[PDB]
Amino acid sequence: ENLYFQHMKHGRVFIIKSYSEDDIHRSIKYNIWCSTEHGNKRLDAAYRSMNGKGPVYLLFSVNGSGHFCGVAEMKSAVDYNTCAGVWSQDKWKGRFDVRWIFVKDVPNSQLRHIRLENNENKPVTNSRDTQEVPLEKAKQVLKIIASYK
């Protein structure tokens, strides 16, 4: 049993869906991420309102890979005017820090059964980018990811 996340009372958790596995390698190497304008705003508002009272975790998955590839914690607000041409999408200017916690592949079949009541009870594995996950469902996800072999 891995119960590190069993008793989280605070926090928010989001799905990250990427069109670029290179963006993810870059994130793991330099501890940075960027979403779409719409995604950045949602993540920024969450991080800022949290005001250090708990974590914002991000659950990463590349579109069409059939698995999650890791989790990271969001570690700064978003900066909207920074060096361009840094991500798969040339025009993206934004940036925020993250600290990667797990990097490992967990097949969707391990997570398929967890459903999101805030997203029409769809499986967590059929989420779009920056879909939010309720804490109690996020705790089940994190345990499975932490413990997967």
Phi, psi (rounded to 5 degrees) for 43: -70, -40
Residue 63 in marked binding region: yes
User: Which CATH number goes with the domain that contains 66?
Assistant: 3.10.590.10
The tokens for 95 are 């940036």
User: Parallel, antiparallel, or unpaired for β 56-62 and 12-18?
Assistant: parallel
Name the helix (H) or strand (E) containing 26. helix 21-30
The response to whether 18 counts as a known ligand-binding position is: yes
Beta-carbon count within 10 A of 10 CB: 9
Sheet holding 132-133, edge to edge: 32-33, 96-107, 67-74, 56-62, 12-18, 132-133
* Count of the separate structural domains present in the chain: 1
Neighbours of 82 (CB within 10 A): 14
Q: Which long-range contacts (CB under 8 A, 24 or more apart) does 74-77 make?
A: 74/33, 74/43, 74/46, 74/47, 74/98, 75/31, 75/99, 76/47, 77/44, 77/47, 77/48
Instruction: Name the experimental technique.
Output: X-ray
Range of the domain at 132: 1-149
- Ligand-binding annotation for 100, yes or no, is no
Please tell me the distance from the alpha carbon of residue 131 to that of residue 39, in angstroms, as a whole number. Answer: 9
Helix (H, G, I), strand (E, B) or coil at 60: strand
The answer on whether 17 is annotated among ligand-binding residues is: yes
Question: To 5 degrees, how large is the angle CA 7–CA 13–CA 15?
Answer: 140
Q: Is 34 annotated as a binding residue?
A: yes
What is the stated resolution of the deposited model, in angstroms?
2.2
Q: Which segments within the chain are labelled E, that is strand? A: 12-18, 32-33, 56-62, 67-74, 96-107, 115-116, 122-123, 132-133
Please indicate if the annotation marks 19 as binding a ligand.
yes
